[PDB]
Design a protein around this ligand. Sequence first.
Ligand SMILES: Cc1cc2nc3c(=O)[nH]c(=O)nc-3n(C[C@H](O)[C@H](O)[C@H](O)COP(=O)(O)OP(=O)(O)OC[C@H]3O[C@@H](n4cnc5c(N)ncnc54)[C@H](O)[C@@H]3O)c2cc1C
Ligand SMILES: Cc1ncc(CO)c(CN)c1O
Length: 508
Amino acid sequence: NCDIVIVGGGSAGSLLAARLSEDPDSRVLLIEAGEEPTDPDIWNPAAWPALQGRSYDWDYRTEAQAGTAGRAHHWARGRLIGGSSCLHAMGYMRGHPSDFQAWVDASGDRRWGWDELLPVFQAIEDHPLGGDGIHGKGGPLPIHLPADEVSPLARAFIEAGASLGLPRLEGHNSGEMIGVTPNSLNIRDGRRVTAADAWLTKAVRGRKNLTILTGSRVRRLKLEGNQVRSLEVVGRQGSAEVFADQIVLCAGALESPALLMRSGIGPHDVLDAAGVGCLIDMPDIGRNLQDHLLGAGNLYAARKPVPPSRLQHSESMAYMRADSFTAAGQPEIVVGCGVAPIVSESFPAPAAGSAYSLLFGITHPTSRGSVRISGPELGDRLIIDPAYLQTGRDRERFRRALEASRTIGHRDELAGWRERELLPGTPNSAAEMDDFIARSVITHHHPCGTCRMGKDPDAVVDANLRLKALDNLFVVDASIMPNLTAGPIHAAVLAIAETFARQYHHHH
Ligand SMILES: Cc1cc2nc3c(=O)[nH]c(=O)nc-3n(C[C@H](O)[C@H](O)[C@H](O)COP(=O)(O)OP(=O)(O)OC[C@H]3O[C@@H](n4cnc5c(N)ncnc54)[C@H](O)[C@@H]3O)c2cc1C
Ligand SMILES: Cc1ncc(CO)c(CN)c1O
């Protein structure tokens, strides 16, 4: 209610609603644009792709991308309690320690380093290796290490990678991320487990100091001096003004910057062009946009029927250096085993069961894009330019990734499954490879960076996640990430939320 308002009930928001309200002297209101879940397919891990295009998916469309053969891309996003966590591939990857070293350099604060994050990840995790001093034990989020249920295709892929020199890992989360392993998953008893499941339990929801408001969109934050004084909330019925002492934005990589721009906080020139009065000129709001790509894909005809995944279809990412299968350290590329024959819209889909794809990507793209509001209204679509493949480094590294994928794909360890390669076949030059890659890449679903945390004067938030231009507004979601982690970012978003919860309880 009165003390703190959380905008957006997604991954970070669900965690915060629970954690902030642990203080009985704190009144917490959670405002979510979507509805509570009712669709049962949501908890079926193997149904995650079918979830897209449904009612609770924002379904943004990017600008045409010159670096991906002029293709425009669809960006699925959760619009319901639990957010993008409902739509997940449910992979759990903390990231690599060096990923977070970059956050430390950017933020000027040690709290964002692997060593300090370690107890934070551990507080979040309920992991089967919990107790080893590295992984968490007894935390709200189950982490599952698949073994028996791993697809024989995925095991064959893992063997192919292992034969090449990649070490065998138990999940990606020990601080060592390069190697071969089934992906760790947020699954318990065969059921997907979301942020909302883990943190917004029946007990938490029963707290008299926690109020959850659904089907309600925050349209503008209203200012008085150097503070946010109230929020304008738009519901199925009409609009209403909500007051608060502290405001935390958890609307995610697209919607957090959009809310700020609608409120007249952002690039003066962007707001002008959107017809929004400028109250605080912050040039970096909406900028620094990053995302991961996967090439869809190194497609193989199967020598025998490919049986449906007993997990989540994309069962094993192999992170590695771009120039060697034996070298250790921070990942540069990734090749993943897709039990489903996944291809972009640029290719015809093979019959089900008849093919599998190896997905290939780069782990730390240097390209940087932007999100801008097109007008003042909730209904005015965002202008999203991820700037995919715009740097020479990103393009060169993706050649390395495709090359790594084909090397793994053609190993004897996969001869039991492989009939022959369907894609890319025979690219005989850099340009031909570049063209196939540009036609094949799709989003890995990890948008972030649009409200970047930094120690420099024009960063959007400081190391405490406070919007630099105001006293009582915080941004606590994927938008603050200075840079992408090597792999999927949900663990990182949750780590961001937990460290902010700890900071709030520490200073109040
Ligand atoms: C299909 C898919 C699969 C994925 N798979 C994985 C995976 O396997 N592993 C992994 O690590 N990551 C994965 N991700 C990414 C991960 O889910 C997100 O990075 C993470 O959930 C980001 O959380 P967040 O709190 O920043 O935003 P979100 O979880 O997206 O939450 C934003 C919430 O705020 C609400 N909201 C937005 N605007 C407003 C407003 N104006 N007023 C009120 N409410 C608002 C939205 O409805 C939403 O509920 C996947 C993403 C997608 C789309
Ligand atoms: C397209 C896609 N494939 C596989 C995975 C497995 O982690 C993810 C999750 N980001 C994904 O988005």
